[PDB]
């Protein structure tokens with residue numbers, strides 16, 4: 001299974017559990033496998049978070065996925081390579097004020113260590129739209145510049161909060177505990193966010209990729225290309241054009257979802 005994954009992300013480097021390999025893997029993964037919620041949008045739950053199910057979808061079938069699928073898959077890969085992987089749970093606070101109601105635990109991230117590491121590293125390749133394209137030092141206060149935006153971790157209560165410089169200000173993305181969460185808890189969270197009528201992944205369409213000094217973000221029919229210099233926004237004309245963008249620009253095997261007419265009609269009723 002390891003080979004199939006490495007070919008999918010077009011990785012060619014060494015496979016020893018080191019910092020450089022972790023960097024190169026995260027970079028290759030985020031540039032190759034899109035974030036998408038086509039399953040929950042089409043009424044297909046994300047329930048099965050085993051190595052076999054995630055590799056079947058994200059590698060063999062050339063589909064994307066969301067946080068549970070992305071960090072699930074890379075978590076299994078890193079474990080096989082010799083990294084120590086702990087799975088964590090998070091609450092998403094992006095664009096919300098500090099007095100917003102407590103969000104559900106619907107995000108999952110990884111705490112990663114390896115032979116000779118000075119400290120633990122945060123790995124998150126599943127936070128569609130703003131996922132860090134580098135492993136980040138799991139330490140507070142330090143500004144950590146990536147290939148795209150800079151990131152910063154801060155101590156918030158009994159846990160931590162990940163922040164990123166978006167446009168002109170520091171934005172809180174998600175807060176999380178560093179306590180290990182059992183697989184079953186992650187399944188419960190993934191079920192909620194993929195099946196609940198109020199979930200943004202059920203009511204709408206979201207897709208995201210990086211290629212390579214730019215972010216390609218899609219919210220329904222609204223396509224945004226974020227570069228270091230600025231941002232360009234494209235209003236997609238119809239549901240048919242949205243599907244084309246998902247297949248071409250985002251590299252998703254849209255045929256896997258089923259008949260294109262059904263996907264177009266779902267996008268038409270939801271986004272238009």
Ligand SMILES: NNc1nncc2ccccc12
Pocket residue numbers: 066067068092106107108126127128129193
């Ligand atoms: N799939 N996990 C996620 N859960 N809630 C909100 C999110 C917002 C952006 C990206 C991923 C998210």
Ligand SMILES: NNc1nncc2ccccc12
Pocket residue numbers: 147148149150165166167168226227228
């Ligand atoms: N470097 N500061 C930055 N701040 N906001 C957005 C960015 C997007 C791409 C690259 C850099 C960015």
